[PDB]
Amino acid sequence: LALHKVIMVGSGGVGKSALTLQFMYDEFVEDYEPTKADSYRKKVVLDGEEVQIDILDTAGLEDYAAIRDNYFRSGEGFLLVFSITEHESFTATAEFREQILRVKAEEDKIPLLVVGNKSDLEERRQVPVEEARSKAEEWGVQYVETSAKTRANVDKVFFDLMREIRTKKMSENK
Numbered sequence: 001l002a003l004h005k006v007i008m009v010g011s012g013g014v015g016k017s018a019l020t021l022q023f024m025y026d027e028f029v030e031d032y033e034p035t036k037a038d039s040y041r042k043k044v045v046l047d048g049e050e051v052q053i054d055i056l057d058t059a060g061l062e063d064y065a066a067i068r069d070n071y072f073r074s075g076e077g078f079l080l081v082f083s084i085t086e087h088e089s090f091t092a093t094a095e096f097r098e099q100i101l102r103v104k105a106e107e108d109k110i111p112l113l114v115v116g117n118k119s120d121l122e123e124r125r126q127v128p129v130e131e132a133r134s135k136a137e138e139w140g141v142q143y144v145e146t147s148a149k150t151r152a153n154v155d156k157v158f159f160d161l162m163r164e165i166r167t168k169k170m171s172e173n174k
């Protein structure tokens with residue numbers, strides 16, 4: 001059993017928790033769960049391999065001075081999630097990107113995945129999907145569109161992330 005910890009990193013006020021709920025109950029509902037140290041654990045099969053997945057949502061980390069870094073150093077994988085309706089998200093999210101390597105200066109292969117919610121609004125999309133893939137590709141990841149309201153491809157970023165870890169992280173070569 002491979003216990004992989006995913007950190008919902010982002011700008012600071014997008015909606016990472018949203019994708020967090022959809023992956024847990026596959027249902028769009030507002031309840032707001034207080035976070036401080038409590039994480040979510042469950043078992044899911046991966047191409048014929050049952051591994052553990054620990055999710056830990058992170059609120060506005062743009063408040064703490066360095067306490068925020070802890071949330072990133074407490075996890076192996078990272079998920080940079082932002083919103084298309086908020087051009088401020090994609091920008092701030094870019095800043096955190098560099099912060100990820102800081103907490104993992106000892107590590108080499110750093111698993112990451114970028115995604116943009118609010119995709120349910122193709123008419124209110126300010127950031128072109130193609131433009132988001134190119135910029136994000138620089139970091140070494142693939143960007144995808146998702147809708148926390150349709151819960152269609154929300155789980156895609158969760159499963160794909162883990163797969164990237166078992167392959168890239170365990171590689172330590174390529």
Ligand SMILES: Nc1nc2c(ncn2[C@@H]2O[C@H](COP(=O)(O)OP(=O)(O)NP(=O)(O)O)[C@@H](O)[C@H]2O)c(=O)[nH]1
Nearest residue numbers: 012013014015016017018059060117118147148149
């Ligand atoms: N239509 C739509 N609404 C979304 C999506 N993701 C999040 N939302 C909405 O955005 C809001 C979430 O923001 P909020 O809970 O205030 O804060 P947050 O963005 O979770 N981060 P924080 O917990 O730090 O405040 C909710 O109203 C939720 O329904 C999405 O993909 N589509």
Ligand SMILES: [Mg+2]
Nearest residue numbers: 015016017018
């Ligand atoms: Mg939240």
